[PDB]
């Protein structure tokens, strides 16, 4: 927790040494070193603390991670591979951004996303008709505007050269992967 991290930050400066797990647990108000160990591990997994041989190696962030691709046209293979990061604020985008995707195709030209761009997605599964979403249809991803009714869902284009893609929920699997929130272009 943030308070636990602060306790190490000032205790180490005040005394010159980090507090023991027993001391942290006692300050937390519970009779178990596990209380301190859980928070120390959580901070370490966050990348804020280092651990070696059961002891802290030190008390020593890269921005949105680019994860994979997405297709404006026909669906494209879904496979996560974190190839790199970009240093940009989550606060810029309307709901906070979670990761970036690379766009191929031209089926959303009118709204303003085109080939080779980066699209910021906000992770969620609650969405409604008329929004811009990301969907997986049998291990293949597409970005389009949603229109759900009955047992069939329509994924509409935003370019007059492309025609809508329709999937029947009784034959193919459909999971919504998030909600688009913006774009970054550097080409």
């Amino acid at each position: 927790q943030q308070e636990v991290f602060d306790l190490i930050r000032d205790h180490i400066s005040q005394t010159g040494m980090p507090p023991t797990r027993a001391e942290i647990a006692q300050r937390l108000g519970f009779r178990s070193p596990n209380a301190a160990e859980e928070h120390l591990k959580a901070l370490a997994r966050k990348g804020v603390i280092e651990i070696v041989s059961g002891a802290s190696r030190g008390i020593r962030e890269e921005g949105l991670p680019l994860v994979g691709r997405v297709a404006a046209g026909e669906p494209l293979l879904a496979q996560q591979h974190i190839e790199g990061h970009y240093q940009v604020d989550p606060s810029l985008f309307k709901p906070n951004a979670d990761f970036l995707l690379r766009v191929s195709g031209m089926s959303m030209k009118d709204i303003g996303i085109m080939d080779g761009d980066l699209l910021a997605v906000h992770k969620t599964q609650d969405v409604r008709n008329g929004q811009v979403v990301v969907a997986r249809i049998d291990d293949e991803v597409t970005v389009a505007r949603l229109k759900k009714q009955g047992n069939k869902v329509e994924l509409l284009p935003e370019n007059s050269e492309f025609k809508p893609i329709v999937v029947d929920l009784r034959q193919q699997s459909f999971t919504i992967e998030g909600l688009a929130v913006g774009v970054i272009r550097n080409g």
Partner: protein, 325 residues
């Protein structure tokens, strides 16, 4: 060929020399691989299961909604085994068992072991400890939604414990699968129901505790409530149907129904008359039941009462109905 015969014999000798006598044999010669079953307390359900009961040395799972009757079913199962001389244990992770109601369904309350663990790991450790002993024939775990991990116990509310109980359950099944079959014990897990958020198509209900038990079980049952049983203007029981949603010892997907009467358990004699009709051993002369050329009653209640008061016909019907199905 002649060379292959001796080449295989030497390998079998080596394996039996290293890992012990019986580490390999012809599948048609191992009598430890035969299946044995024990009754479940309700005749319709034994017919549905195919083999005639629940298998020993295996894992069984029973899940359903609330006030559905899956503790009475398990106490009914316990009761029959004790009548045959088998020792039993019951593990109440939920902290909700009533001793007297167990005594009143038929259970010998002075010989049934009981534990109330403070952590799921402790419950599973006790399960393994009794399985290794070779002296307990039936274990029951009151609920899996209550098996809390130790890390979750010592923490605070609101902490994230993503996927920890599932990992614990996988480890547990992995470690118990062998001891159960070696000791020939039956382990029954009861489970609850929750909802899947954001599902687009299909049935949203699921169970808690992960995916491992869906694989490692031999039999899974679904138990639900249908209606009320009226002794008059006041309710005196429930109507139940069970489904066999999984089965590794017989054909799956069958069904079964019966009544649970508060304070007594399943009414066997109510099942007997229904099975007799369906099998032409009992005559329904319209609104009137009939048997062997005589008139019986004006309804199911009268028929079962008459049968109860008349052991001769009850035995005659039961010992024939058992044979066909």
């Amino acid at each position: 060929d002649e060379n292959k015969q001796k080449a295989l014999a030497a390998a079998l000798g080596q394996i039996e020399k290293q890992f012990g006598k019986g580490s390999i044999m012809r599948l048609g010669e191992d009598r430890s691989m035969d299946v044995e079953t024990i009754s479940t307390g309700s005749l319709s359900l034994d017919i549905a299961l195919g083999a005639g009961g629940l298998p020993m040395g295996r894992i069984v799972e029973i899940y359903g909604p609330e006030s559905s009757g899956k503790t009475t079913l398990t106490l009914q199962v316990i009761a029959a085994a004790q009548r045959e001389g088998k020792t039993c244990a019951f593990i109440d992770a939920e902290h909700a068992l009533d001793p007297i109601y167990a005594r009143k369904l038929g259970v010998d309350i002075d010989n049934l072991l009981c534990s109330q663990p403070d952590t799921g790991e402790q419950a599973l450790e006790i399960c393994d400890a009794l399985a290794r002993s070779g002296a307990v024939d039936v274990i029951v775990v009151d609920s899996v939604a209550a098996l809390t991990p130790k890390a979750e116990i010592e923490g605070e509310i609101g902490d994230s414990h993503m996927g920890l109980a599932a990992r614990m359950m996988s480890q547990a099944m992995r470690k118990l699968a062998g001891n159960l079959k070696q000791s020939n014990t039956l382990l029954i897990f009861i489970n609850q129901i929750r909802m899947k958020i954001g599902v687009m198509f299909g049935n949203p209900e699921t169970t808690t505790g992960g995916n491992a038990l869906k694989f490692y079980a031999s039999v899974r049952l679904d138990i639900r409530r249908i209606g009320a049983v009226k002794e008059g203007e006041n309710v005196v029981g429930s109507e139940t149907r069970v489904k066999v949603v999984k089965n590794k010892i017989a054909a799956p997907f069958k069904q079964a129904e019966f009544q649970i009467l508060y304070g007594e358990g399943i009414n066997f004699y109510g099942e007997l008359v229904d099975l007799g009709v369906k099998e032409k051993l009992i005559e329904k002369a319209g609104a009137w039941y009939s048997y062997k050329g005589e008139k019986i009653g004006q309804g199911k209640a009268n028929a079962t009462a008459w049968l109860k008061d008349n052991p001769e016909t009850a035995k005659e019907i039961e010992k024939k109905v058992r044979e066909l199905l």
